[PDB]
Subunit: 261 residues, 2 copies
């Protein structure tokens, strides 16, 4: 009796429209190497939770002005996290993810019909590259740098580098059909993108659990993500496009910035 | 998994604060089935469902509730197909809370009424020995059944203008019983209530002017029934005569 992996119950009352979840650190998006301990709630989990709440409270979705300022910590004690949905304008809602009361994440949401879903010309992007790296080669090069370095690159098949962009070929871990049916964002996507963004950042020229995102457009439900095209947006701010095998974009993130120490 | 036997889930959204339940007809409140077919939703199940929704909608939680101007005009039918029933709550200017029980492409409202949380300063009582000494007849459980599946009646004290029913309640008091204010099978105790006081078929409808609940989880050992089918006043009390529930202006509709 659970609405979504990240939205367990509708706990709306006289004073508020909201959803509540209780997390131990062992759940799907929380899923970590050999058990748990204290840690930051995953970045994508905030977007996926907010999206799931908005869809319950109601095809194309646009989230704007998203900000995770005070990170939610999980894996130490049992946390009860709430997602409130509030009015903003005629075609716009506000959301807040909060616990205990501390607001961890907030943003605006619109429901819209995307008249032109964008695409990527994958063969052209691939032919333009100056280097193509295996998953090991990325790790080996990131380990060299002092600021940047990570653990696993299990989701990365190969990385196509060009001046101004990285095109990552993904092989995200297997998730059950019934569980993947409720999700848009895969629970392992951040573990693949983060080393890839660091690879873009280090070639041009730590995480504290915070981030900001100017805009997020979701063009279809249940998008198949085989590639991620990462660029600098026109402190490091990025534009990320996630597409299928054919280049049809399912998710676009514009003005994405992760906070560091 | 389930909030209450009659409120399975909170399905509130942007457009409405509501609860939804899916019923089959094989449940414990509709257990005294003459056959395995279509039947009217029990009369008191509408009150218990509405009360459960209102209590969920709040929570500080006050002990006293008053439901007023209750009306069940279009009966909910159960036991034919799987029915999805909703209870919507709608706050008001006076601080009162309206409700609607409804189902179904084409939505039908089966029951509606007004609800209010109150602190009852003076909980009423019954002088049981005095009421019992006024009676002209006392009927055994059988003698009642011989006039008219039902049980849960120890004896009936009949006087001019009233019937005082001594109730034999199983009283499960489990996590499922602790959620209800009206005991299960109490819903059928209204079917023969009109038959004993007076000395035609029910059409699934009713009207009720006022309902006051003086405590949560009330122990109901007696029901005093009077005239306010005709309109009735029903007081439900414990062994000492402390009233837990009072129904005023209760009128069940007749088919012919």
């Amino acid at each position: 009796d659970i609405l979504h992996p990240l939205l367990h119950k509708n706990t709306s009352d006289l004073y508020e429209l909201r959803y509540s979840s209780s997390f131990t650190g062992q759940e799907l998006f929380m899923a970590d190497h050999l058990g748990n301990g204290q840690r930051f709630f995953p970045l994508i989990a905030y977007l996926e939770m907010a999206r799931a709440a908005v869809k319950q409270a109601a095809s194309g979705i646009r989230m704007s002005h998203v900000a995770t300022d005070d990170p939610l910590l999980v894996g130490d004690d049992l946390v009860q996290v709430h997602v409130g949905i509030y009015p903003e304008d005629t075609g716009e809602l506000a959301y807040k993810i909060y616990s205990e009361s501390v607001v961890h994440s907030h943003g605006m949401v619109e429901f819209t019909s995307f008249v032109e879903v964008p695409t990527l010309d994958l063969p052209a992007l691939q032919a333009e590259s100056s280097e193509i790296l295996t998953a090991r080669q990325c790790y080996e090069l990131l380990k060299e740098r002092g600021m940047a370095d990570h653990s696993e690159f299990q989701g990365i098949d190969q990385v196509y580098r060009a001046p101004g962009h990285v095109l990552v070929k993904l092989s995200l871990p297997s998730i059950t059909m019934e569980t993947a049916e409720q999700l848009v964002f895969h629970p392992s996507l951040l573990e693949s993108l983060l080393p890839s963004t660091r690879y873009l950042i280090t070639e041009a020229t730590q995480l504290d659990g915070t981030f900001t995102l100017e805009e997020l457009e979701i063009y279809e439900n249940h998008p198949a993500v085989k590639y991620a095209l990462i660029r600098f947006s026109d402190t490091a701010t990025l534009d990320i496009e996630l597409c299928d095998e054919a280049g049809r974009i399912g998710i676009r993130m514009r003005g994405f910035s992760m906070g560091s120490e």
